[PDB]
Amino acid sequence: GQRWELALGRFWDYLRWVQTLSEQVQEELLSSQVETKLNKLMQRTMEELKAYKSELEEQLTPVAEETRARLSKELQAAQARLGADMEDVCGRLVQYRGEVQAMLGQSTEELRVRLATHLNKLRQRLLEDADDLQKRLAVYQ
């Protein structure tokens, strides 16, 4: 398991707890603690990923520059897909905080159900985009 995969694993571990939407989660969500921690976990994932990309590129047996730039761009695509998935996670959690803050004490049940439905979809993308990224990195080296 590469460093970036472990970093993504810590992102997953925290996201999974957040999705329970317990009252403890709601506490740390409305205090912006959740969006702060998820942002850091996301950044460390992308940083490790960037550095790990540079690693494989240097150990790559030389090839025609055209293929070199294509595989590079193919990996930036998968790299960008993962990044967008995580950013979207943080976003919907920020949005939820803003909505509750504007709800003046009414029931957040329906908001939490819609949030869970959206996190489940974003979650599905991260599995897919992360898997494709792992495959494209392996064939790389």
Residue numbers in the entry: 19 to 159
Excerpt from the publication:
As the sole target of neutralizing antibodies, the virion surface protein Env encodes a glycan shield to restrict the antibody access to antigenically conserved sites. Small protein mimics of the CONEs are designed by epitope transplantation and used as immunogens to focus the antibody response. Here we focus our protein design efforts on four CONEs, including the structural elements of β sheet 12/13/22 (CONE 1), α2 helix (CONE 2), loop C (CONE 4), and loop E (CONE 5).
The C2S5 scaffold is built on a four-helix bundle from apolipoprotein E3. The two helixes used to display the CONE 2 residues were well matched to the α2 helix in terms of the Cα-Cβ orientations. For instance, a discontinuous three β-strand motif was grafted onto CONE 1 scaffolds, while the two helixes on the CONE 2 and scaffold 5 design (C2S5, a similar nomenclature is followed for all designed proteins) displayed the α2 helix-specific residues. Comparison with the Env trimer protein revealed a high degree of mimicry: within the epitope region, the Cα RMSDs between the designed proteins and Env were 0.42 Å (C2S5) and 0.34 Å (C4S3), respectively, suggesting that our CONE mimetics accurately display the Env residues. The electron density maps revealed that the side chains of the grafted residues were well positioned relative to the computational model. We selected the most stable designs (C1S1, C2S5, and C4S3) for immunization experiments and further structural analysis. The CONE 1, 2, and 4 proteins were monomeric in solution, while the C5S3 design displayed rapid exchange between monomeric and dimeric states. No HIV-specific antibodies were obtained after immunization with CONE 2 (α2 helix).
